[PDB]
Design a protein around this ligand. Structure first.
Ligand SMILES: Nc1ncnc2c1ncn2[C@@H]1O[C@H](CSCC[C@H](N)C(=O)O)[C@@H](O)[C@H]1O
Lengths: 284, 255, 255, 255, 255
């Protein structure tokens, strides 16, 4: 590719540019069809190396630090096998959740509204969100609805989980949540809903739209809910928090941690602990 | 040996019961498939040849099992082995405080009816048929093999109805063996673990995969032909009586 | 301690249930005697004072138990302990070749209906009432104690129906304990041996004194008061859950 | 009641043994802490007052136990209750293919020496001491309580030696109860699950929370005081003989 | 099938071990009689043809078993099956008040060493030899069969030492099955009761002829060939793992 015609002086020009690039990275560079977009991507691609080597340099510096102390310097009940035992324990709990647990739906029908940066970030929040469900005392039955098998979102999920994808204790499906559940019990959670969520209802299916629009697109989740006949609710952030800073649309890992706290009889004081403290000045 | 014996297999149209009939017939025995009319056991009976027939009967009905046993006695002249494999299950918690659902009484009743009394309904009726048999050299008239589950020992969440019925089979195994000891009838119970049967297949595929991997060794679902092998071993061993044999691959079910 | 606790004892008009109520009420608790209308529980409830009330109900019917628990809620405001002492027995061989007599299916179903179905029916409805209670400092909402004699393990000749019912209670003790673990309800099972219940004192002195001498130590029939003592011990111990406790004086029933 | 009784508690300087001594002395009984000289038994016996004394002895040595039993007779005049809480734990895989490591035989022998052999050494010697007692109104001469573990039923990976020693205690509890029944001595066994002994509390907080979460209910490690409560209940209840009681909060250990 | 398998039979010079070797060699397998030098195993090995060899070794000695296992490696190349049948017994009671006799400590130690420690000594050493085998189509490297006794559950009077060692084998059969699960080795336990062994001929004939009538059915002493048949059944069934199989003819041992 001739796209090297930009990089090979942009390094000499004085802008921050990474030294190691591949054709796969080079391909995504040419979709950036403006000077600022290319500069923004190159800045991201440059800082990837910057924290890599800095953390790289840290780790073998530690290797010398421990190898000198490790080489120079009884009755037990259990073998030290806890990480294996914890994973098995969460597996049994997840298997029980898939049968009797309350369903929670992550709507994957937002692939067409996301750029590559946003789509990748959605998976990262999805990975953390499902991780917190596993470690909970009373896990949800997590559903991935509207997830196209060949779609971009599915391929990214497979790449991140690798072998674990086929072994996850969650129900991923092509069908919409309206096909799996009665339309009366579905409550599409969205920040733009005019109805404020008062109490957590254990006989309802809460739908979270897996949409991370860093280029914020208000009303997208509400439009989907009103395109169907689904009811909507919004978190009582204004009721219990003194907001000052930032968007009121929380991340997927914060949302699931708020719902999990509510499901475990926690009040709104404990549940809203997971709203970033940088966005408000205390609970009232 | 097993050749020449007549075996009445309840729920023999599918699952563990069908695998037992395939092995026993293949070994030279004669089998009668006792299952519901809509279970499709007629096709299976024709597939196994002239040595296997299908008796449409419901184990929970006294008259139905009597018709089946008369059919077995008419076709083959005698009954030598009874294998109780017919069973159902439900997935329902005793009480779900969050959702406010209580386990219904009909679900508990129907599981108890099919799994527990229907097993006892067969045992008392066929023991009369075995009671007509002349003793062999060891003084034995027949062998009754029941099917409990590991749920009778470590039941899972939502398995209360299933565990109560299978637990009952374990409880009455020894008393029935003592009851029929005068007349030379052995009563044995098998407690299979996770097996490739439609009862466990109804679970989600990802739940089945996790459960299969949790079996210490072999790390797979129990193949039904391995259940049939254990049944043949119990039939051929004269000293096995009044005992519950766990066939689960050393798995212990967590809640 | 048990002072202030409200206990619903099924079959509390006689036998083990009555002994449990006398101890619990004598220790400062309140007891709701749940038994048959003709069992004479009203006379027993009057003798035990104002802290004990009689609720006539048949455990086999969901309607009667619901009204009985509504009476327990009305009189004392809450339910803390459920003691399932209600039970019947039948002595009949599975099959008698010398007599051509077969165990009656109605007899087998009748024993299961009261011993097994009635116990679960009480458990599933009582768990709804303990679910309304606020967890205490230890997070406990209630205790359920079931009765299932040693016949569940080593039943005697002609005890197939009784062992099947008691084997069911033992088998389902753990799955129910896992079911109610999120709620905070402990489910425990007691396996009494030969006790001086009005049933055992009815049979002639020949079998009465012989069986009392068959207990290794103490060589006597179990005092129902000793059953009540172990019932109270389970209530007071927070860490007893999902376990079957044999209270028999180490006797193993021979055929 | 337990007031006036004399209790010999092996391994009574810490853990379950110390908790049993604290409750029995508090309830009005006298205790003898039978533990190793290097343990803090002398400080513990002083803390419990003049009703508790420390007898240094190794349960694996016949001579050491006899001197301890002589001390109990000298100080208090008689022996009423023996509690066998002394024991060690060793975690070691039977064979590790990747590491080429085989379980060491000396590891197996030492666990069997203290847990299994040590328990029986106390039992055979303390039984003779209770054989000198005049029977009470019930004809009883003493109570012997052994401490098995849940590993005797579901041992985890690496607990081959520990489970074998604890499984043997479950094995001997009924035959010994039969041996001592003519004498009038009851033998019982308690199988604690995960308890807050110094062995478990020394573990990192990360794994301590996990072990607490594995218990169905209550979701916490067993309080040693709860073990003491069940020990008292066995002593007071005359009809508990030859039975293993699991005190584990319905936990079933995973591999 | 068992054809071509190499089995190391512990204590195979008489009783259950000799019967197991007799059946396996007849079916086409190879056997190694691991017994004491004075047991007369060389005559048994010669009588069984070139497929059977004698390895004189004490199960309590690590050196003796390693040489015996190396002999099997030299003669046959691999070890596929291990059957632990060697065991001794003692009839001393725990304590005799009338005679002032206490169970001597060495009798308990000697029985424990041969039965419990000896079984584990063979298990851990044969696990290394089985770990060298290539996993078969089912991923299995070998099968280890242990011989407990019915005394592990309902041991009689004067069987405290025997029940302890046999209870230990039952206790550790699951952790070892869990320990060896990643390798691909199945551990199963047989619990025979009253078999026609030399052990059941040392006792007085009138007592022995009385026990033969105590078995409900078959009302006789167990044929060692029946034990050999069950061992072959366990070998050929891939899903039998971690379970104790009672082979007693439904007998429950009275005090
Ligand atoms: N304050 C809030 N109350 C309820 N749900 C919220 C919320 N903030 C975010 N969410 C949920 O978290 C998900 C990602 S926030 C993105 C929402 C979407 N881009 C929009 O503009 O409407 C959404 O599906 C939404 O349902």
């Amino acid at each position: 590719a001739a796209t090297r015609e930009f990089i090979e002086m942009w390094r000499l020009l004085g802008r921050e540019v990474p030294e190691h690039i591949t054709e796969e990275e080079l391909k995504t560079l040419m979709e950036c069809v403006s000077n600022t977009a290319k500069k923004k991507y190159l800045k991201y691609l440059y800082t990837k190396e910057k924290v890599k080597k800095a953390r790289q340099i840290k780790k073998e510096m530690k290797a010398a630090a421990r190898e000198e102390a490790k080489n120079i310097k009884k009755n037990f009940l259990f073998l030290r096998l806890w990480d294996r035992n914890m994973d098995i324990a969460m597996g049994w709990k997840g298997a029980q959740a898939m049968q009797f647990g309350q369903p929670l739906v992550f709507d994957m029908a937002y692939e067409n509204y996301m750029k590559r940066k946003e789509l990748q970030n959605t998976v990262s929040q999805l990975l953390e969100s499902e991780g917190w469900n596993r470690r909970n005392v009373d896990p949800f039955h997590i559903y991935f609805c509207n997830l196209k098998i060949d779609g971009a979102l599915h391929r990214e999920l497979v790449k991140r989980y690798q072998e674990k994808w086929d072994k996850l204790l969650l129900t991923s499906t092509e069908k919409s949540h309206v096909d799996l559940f009665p339309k009366d019990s579905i409550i599409y959670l969205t920040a733009d809903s005019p109805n404020v969520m008062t109490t957590f209802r254990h006989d309802k299916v809460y739908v979270i739209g897996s949409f991370v629009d860093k280029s914020m697109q208000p009303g997208t989740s509400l439009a989907k809910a009103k395109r169907l006949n689904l009811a909507t609710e919004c978190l009582p952030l204004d009721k219990y928090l003194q907001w000052e800073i930032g968007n009121k649309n929380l991340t997927l890992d914060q949302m699931i941690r708020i719902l999990l706290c509510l499901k475990n009889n926690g009040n709104w004081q404990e549940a809203l602990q997971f709203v970033p403290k940088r966005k408000h000045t205390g609970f009232l | 040996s097993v050749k020449g014996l007549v075996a009445v297999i309840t729920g023999g149209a599918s699952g563990l019961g069908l695998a037992t009939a395939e092995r026993l017939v293949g070994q030279g025995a004669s089998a009668v498939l006792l299952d519901l009319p809509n279970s499709g056991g007629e096709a299976q009976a024709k597939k196994l040849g002239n040595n296997c027939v299908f008796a449409p009967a419901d184990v929970t009905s006294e008259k139905d099992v009597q018709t089946a046993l008369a059919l077995a006695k008419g076709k083959f002249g005698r009954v030598d082995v009874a294998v109780n494999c017919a069973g159902i299950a439900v997935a329902s918690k005793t009480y779900n405080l969050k959702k406010g659902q209580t386990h219904t009484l009909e679900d508990f009743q129907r599981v108890l009816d099919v799994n527990l009394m229907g097993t006892f309904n067969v045992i008392r009726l066929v023991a009369g048929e075995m009671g007509q048999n002349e003793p062999d050299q060891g003084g034995q008239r027949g062998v009754i093999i029941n099917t409990a589950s590991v749920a009778a020992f470590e039941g899972q969440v939502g398995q209360a109805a299933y565990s109560a019925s299978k637990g009952g089979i374990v409880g009455m195994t020894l008393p029935i063996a003592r009851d029929l000891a005068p007349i030379g009838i052995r009563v044995m119970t098998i407690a299979p673990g996770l097996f490739g049967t439609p009862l466990l297949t109804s679970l989600p595929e990802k739940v089945c995969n996790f459960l299969a991997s949790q079996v210490p060794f072999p790390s797979r679902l129990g193949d039904p032909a391995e259940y049939a092998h254990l049944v043949q071993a119990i039939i051929e061993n004269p000293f096995l009586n009044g005992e519950v044999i766990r066939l689960d691959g050393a798995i212990r079910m967590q809640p």
